[PDB]
Every structure is written in structure tokens, then in C-alpha cells.
Amino acid sequence: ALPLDTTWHRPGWTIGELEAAKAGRTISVVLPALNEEATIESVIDSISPLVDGLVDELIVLDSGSTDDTEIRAIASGARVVSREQALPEVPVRPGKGEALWRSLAATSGDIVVFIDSDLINPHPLFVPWLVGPLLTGEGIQLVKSFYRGGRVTELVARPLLAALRPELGCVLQPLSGEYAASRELLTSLPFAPGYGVEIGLLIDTFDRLGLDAIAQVNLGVRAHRNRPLDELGAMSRQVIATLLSRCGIPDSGVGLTQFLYTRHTWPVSLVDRPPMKVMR
Amino acid sequence: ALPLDTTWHRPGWTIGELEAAKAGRTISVVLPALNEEATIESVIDSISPLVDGLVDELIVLDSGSTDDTEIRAIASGARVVSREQALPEVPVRPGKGEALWRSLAATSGDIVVFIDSDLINPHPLFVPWLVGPLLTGEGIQLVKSFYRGGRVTELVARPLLAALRPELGCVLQPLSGEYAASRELLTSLPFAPGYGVEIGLLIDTFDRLGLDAIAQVNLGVRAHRNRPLDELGAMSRQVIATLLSRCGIPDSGVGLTQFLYTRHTWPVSLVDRPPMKVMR
Ligand SMILES: O=c1ccn([C@@H]2O[C@H](COP(=O)(O)OP(=O)(O)O[C@H]3O[C@H](CO)[C@@H](O)[C@H](O)[C@H]3O)[C@@H](O)[C@H]2O)c(=O)[nH]1
Ligand SMILES: O=c1ccn([C@@H]2O[C@H](COP(=O)(O)OP(=O)(O)O[C@H]3O[C@H](CO)[C@@H](O)[C@H](O)[C@H]3O)[C@@H](O)[C@H]2O)c(=O)[nH]1
Ligand SMILES: [Cl-]
Ligand SMILES: [Cl-]
Ligand SMILES: [Mn+2]
Ligand SMILES: [Mn+2]
């Protein structure tokens, strides 16, 4: 391991050991989903055998899907929750960060696990491998995954971290959509909008609790949707905006423009959601 | 055009018109090269027909090649200049920015044109298309190229510019290796090290002379060496470091680390070369 608790190899914990270690703590699993009809069922099925055992609760956080995502998830026995149902007093904003933040209001596990719903054949041990350090460690409040090409991660986020928060240089996949954390931690932190949510959570956690509260576990290999370069441009812009803000640097608020030769401007947001705590 | 003089279409100027417009001004062409034996001859040949006419001078700036770059360039009739010969009183540093800066001491054109030496079948009109606005415009001191996937450009540089210098959002290929500028401008500016040199030159030019001094011309389509993702990681890191510095933001000076699972740290430099002017 580096100065960051890193599980480099297959965790050795059995499902039954992990379950014993809960000690009254509960576990929620959240799957955010926007138009993932092709992969959603495989993801739910990888995890539903854990329900009523290690996992106390599983939801799909449907983020405005217009395909068959919701019906197929229901048919896999999952509880599907819209953004509106998760938190109906508050009008819905677009983007991933909004979905995860709302999901805090729709779950009650002491521990919350996020798994992206666009994964291709995910391992059924993903969730156990992630909760290990939270269950059996001390002071770990956040566990990030890593894996084996991560264009935004390797060109934008990791190099920017080296520039502005080099202490986090040892985190191999800071933008990974698969991770777990304590409710106490998550409901105490703001949530960046859009694709800024992961990078925001990591830096805030570090700034507030330091490295000793963070672990990372090998999930082996991951496959997912490969988005077009232009969609990555918009994602990177939001990651940059969120990353700059945590480092005390003013962002223009100006969206990325691209020329296809036609021109298009993508939205960027400088507005975080506050800690879900204030909503109590 | 946008607020930035943009030549969207094939320039209409003939080689003879352009030559007339020189009016005593001279033109140097510089080809930086590090191990480009496969493509260097095609690039030189695309340009050497202009020599003693529109172009007064052509050099290859050899940046420590250990392949056959120099012998093949000589065999194409090019003058080849090492980093050491360009400026022998000053010990040589690694990276592209060093090569271009040194090239100022090895040329005397009032106008300097840079063309990367790894281009696959470059158009023989590249150089005329670039000098057009400098020759026939007023107050233009810098001309950048654009083209048609630019991973570092679209994920790192363009989104970072939108964040920190949104006025430059209209520049389509800020990192393009093909561009031209006045000696008066170039010898008045510092040169960022490594791959930071292009982004550094653009921001300094803008900060010092504003947009009205900058033009961009369509070169159509370009092909070149596609580097592995890890090499791009190091390039992006240096672009970020240089970009952050021009915007008044402190960089850690810490190199990007990558885990292949073995670990490697890449060099980054926070040291610019001063304006070549001080070397007079
Ligand atoms: O508005 C949205 C956008 C995405 N998602 C879901 O979020 C997950 C990941 O989104 P994706 O479009 O696949 O983003 P990636 O290109 O994969 O981005 C990677 O890097 C991002 C930057 O941190 C992370 O947010 C992602 O989890 C991570 O997979 C998917 O299951 C989506 O269904 C939503 O629920 N709502
Ligand atoms: O130490 C070096 C490195 C590169 N080069 C030359 O510079 C040119 C471009 O370098 P390259 O390795 O192809 O960089 P790219 O991946 O193509 O980077 C693009 O984006 C960079 C960031 O601004 C620019 O520096 C480049 O010109 C541009 O092609 C090539 O002809 C090389 O021969 C050197 O002379 N010395
Ligand atoms: Cl608090
Ligand atoms: Cl000056
Ligand atoms: Mn994905
Ligand atoms: Mn190249």
C-alpha cells in the first residue's frame, strides 16, 4: 500500500464474514440510470441476490429515462425511484450529481453504495469488495474503486489533481462511478452538479477527513458505454469547474463551445446542492 | 468570422501575390524534429519548392534524434541544426519548447513559421495559407491553424480555456503545431518548456496584444503520429501547468504519476525560457 489504504488484490472476506461485521449498520445500494435499457438488468441481477442479506436495500435512481429502463428494472424486481419521487418538494435539475444527491433522501442505509448502471457484465462481488474497508476497517468513510482507457480521468482529472491537490495523486480512479461511503459523511457534503459529483466528493472528503479516511479496492476490469469525444468535452468542462472551485479558483461559468463547421454550446453549472442534512 | 479573424475557406491568395506583399520582410520556416525519420522527408519536400522565393529560409531543428532523421533531412537538401548549434553558449534542456525557442537564434526571418515534422502527407500550401494574414492583414502578429481527434485539445486545453480565459473560446485548435508569427512578437515572449509552448504563446499574445492581433486559417485535414494515452498524460500535465501559470495560479510542480500495476513519474517543468531578446 501507499499512504492511501489500497487493496491491490482480490479481497479475502467472505459474504458471511462481511454480513457479521455490519453490527446493526444497514447497507443501501443505489443505481443511477439515464437511458440504460441494454445493461440495467445485468447490473441489477449482479446485486439482487444480496438483498435481505448483506444488502438491506436496492434502488434504481431513474434520471428521466425515455427508453425501457424503468420497466426492465421493475421486471428484475428492483424498486425504481424517479428524481421527483426521491424528493418531491424540490424541483428537479438535470445531471448525475442531482440523482445521487436525491438518492440520499430515498435510502436509509448507514452505508450507501453507488454502481453505474451502464456496466457490461459487472462482477457480482463488486458490492462486497467495496464495503470491506468500511465494515472491517477503522475510520474509513469512503471507498473508491479502480480498474484497467479513462480518457477524462488520465488527461484531465489525474493531471489536474497533481497540479492542485497532489496529495491525491495516489488515487488511481478518482472519477470512478463505483464507490461506497457512510451516510454521515455523504449527507454532510454538498453535491456538485452533473458529472462533477465524484471529483467534488473526493476532494471535500480529503479536505475534511484527510487520506486516512479513504480506501481504494481493485474491481479488476470494467467495460462500459464509450461516449463520443464531444460528450466527453462537456463532461471534462464540468469536472474542471468543480475541481477549480474546491481549490479556491474562480470559474468563468462559461460553457464549452464546439464547432462541428457548425457551433454548439454545452451547459456547465457552478451550483452545488447543499448537504442533505439541511433538508432534515 | 467570429470576433477572431477566421479564414474558414481555402485562401484565395496566389503564391506570387503573397511574395509581392512581403515588402522586404523575410520568412523563415522551422521544422522541429525528434525521431521523425518516417515522415520528415515528405514534410521538407512539401516546402522546399518555396525556398529562395516566398520562403527565404528553411531549417530542421533536430531535438536530439537518435534515428535517421538528420541524414534523411540533409538528403532532402535541408539545413539541419541541433539544439547545441542553435545556441551553443546555453546548455540544452529537453522538450519541444526548448527547440522552438532556440530556433529563434538560428533563423533571421522577420516572420517565423512552425510546422510539425510528424505530419502525414502535408499540403504544400500549408505555409502560404498561414502567412496570408500576416502579409496582407494589419496588426496580425500570430496565425494559428485549425483542422478536423485532438484528445488533449478537446478534453484539456479548450475546456480549461473556457474556464480561465473564455475570450479564447473561439480558437479551434489552440495546441496546433502549425502556426506563424512575427519575430518581434516571438522574441518578446517567454517560451514554456516541453509541450507547454503553444498554449503559453497564445495566452501571452492575447494578454499582451488582444484578439485583434490573432488570426486562424483552415488547413483542412491533418494526420499525424497517434501517441499512447500515457504519453498524452504527461503532455496534458505540462499544458495544465503552463496554462495555470499564465492565469496567476500556483502549480504544485509535482509530476503526473501513472500505475501500469507498476508506477512511473513523468517530468513537469515550471521554468519558462525568457524572451530571446535578453540574449542579444
Ligand atoms: O444525467 C445523468 C447522467 C448519467 N447518469 C448515470 O451515471 C452513470 C455514469 O454516467 P456515464 O454517462 O456513463 O459517465 P461516464 O462517461 O462513464 O463517466 C465516468 O466519469 C464520470 C466523472 O466523474 C463519472 O460521473 C461516471 O460515474 C464515470 O463512469 C450511468 O450509469 C448513467 O446512467 C445519470 O443517472 N444521469
Ligand atoms: O521533445 C520534443 C518533442 C516533440 N518535438 C517535435 O514537435 C512536434 C510535435 O510533437 P508531438 O510529439 O507530435 O506532439 P503532439 O502529440 O502532436 O502534440 C500536439 O499538441 C501539442 C501541445 O501544444 C503541440 O506541442 C504539438 O505541436 C501538437 O502536434 C513533432 O514534429 C516533434 O518532432 C520536438 O522537436 N522535441
Ligand atoms: Cl458538519
Ligand atoms: Cl517588451
Ligand atoms: Mn459509463
Ligand atoms: Mn504529432
UniProtKB/Swiss-Prot annotation, chains A, B:
Molecular functions (GO terms): hexosyltransferase activity; magnesium ion binding; protein homodimerization activity
Catalytic reaction(s) noted: an NDP-alpha-D-glucose + (2R)-3-phosphoglycerate = (2R)-2-O-(alpha-D-glucopyranosyl)-3-phospho-glycerate + a ribonucleoside 5'-diphosphate + H(+); (2R)-3-phosphoglycerate + UDP-alpha-D-glucose = (2R)-2-O-(alpha-D-glucopyranosyl)-3-phospho-glycerate + UDP + H(+)
Annotated binding of (2R)-3-phosphoglycerate, by residue: 150-153, 226
Pfam families linked: Glycos_transf_2
EC numbers, comma separated: 2.4.1.266
Keyword Metal-binding appears in the UniProt entry: yes
Similarity remark: Belongs to the glycosyltransferase 2 family.
Note: Was identified as a high-confidence drug target. The glucosyltransferase GpgS does not possess a putative nucleophile residue that could result in the formation of a glycosyl-enzyme covalent intermediate. Therefore, it is expected that the reaction would proceed through a front-side substrate-assisted SNi-type mechanism where the breaking of the glucosidic bond is stabilized by the interaction of the acceptor hydrogen atom O3 of the acceptor 3-PGA with the beta-phosphate of the nucleotide sugar.
Name of this chain's protein: Glucosyl-3-phosphoglycerate synthase
